[PDB]
A paper describes a structure:
Here we report on the combined use of MAS NMR, XRD and microsecond-long molecular dynamics (MD) simulations of explicit crystal lattices to characterize the overall rocking motion and the local internal dynamics of the protein ubiquitin in three different crystal forms.
In MPD-ub, which has been extensively characterized before, one set of well-resolved 1H–15N cross-peaks is observed. In rod-PEG-ub we find—for several instances of well-isolated regions of the spectrum—three peaks per residue. This peak multiplicity is in good agreement with the number of non-equivalent molecules in the asymmetric unit of the crystals, i.e. one (MPD-ub), two (cubic-PEG-ub) and three (rod-PEG-ub), respectively. The overall offset in the ‘base' R1ρ rates of the two crystals points to a global motion that involves the entire molecule. Generally, we can safely conclude that rocking motion in cubic-PEG-ub occurs on the timescale from hundreds of nanoseconds to tens of microseconds. The Wilson B-factor in cubic-PEG-ub is almost fourfold higher than in MPD-ub and the resolution is significantly lower, which we propose to arise from differences in the respective rocking dynamics. As expected, cubic-PEG-ub shows the highest librational as well as translational amplitude among the three crystal structures, in good qualitative agreement with our NMR and MD data. In our case, the packing density is indeed lowest for the crystal with the most pronounced rocking motion, with solvent content Vs of 58% for cubic-PEG-ub, 49% for MPD-ub and 40% for rod-PEG-ub, respectively.
Residue numbers in the entry: 1 to 74
């Protein structure tokens, strides 16, 4: 399946994922794509921020769903 990751930048990134992909996996895919390291990413879906451990299915994220990426730079 496919999901979108819209940036605060504005640009939209599209990812090939699986329903049982962990958020950690999603962060990994974004690093393989945009260079940004996992522990610098925060992911938002329908106003809630996602946990590295739990999966897309758990958050009921199906195809063509949009996730927000916000950077934590510390
Ligand atoms: Zn996967
Ligand atoms: Zn890789
Ligand atoms: Zn949105």
């Amino acid at each position: 399946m496919q999901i979108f990751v819209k940036t605060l930048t504005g640009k939209t990134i599209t990812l090939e994922v699986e329903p049982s992909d962990t958020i950690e996996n999603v962060k990994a895919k974004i690093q393989d794509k945009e260079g940004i390291p996992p522990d610098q990413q925060r992911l938002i879906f329908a106003g809630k921020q996602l946990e590295d451990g739990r999966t897309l299915s758990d958050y009921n994220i199906q195809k063509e769903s949009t996730l927000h990426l916000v950077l934590r730079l510390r």
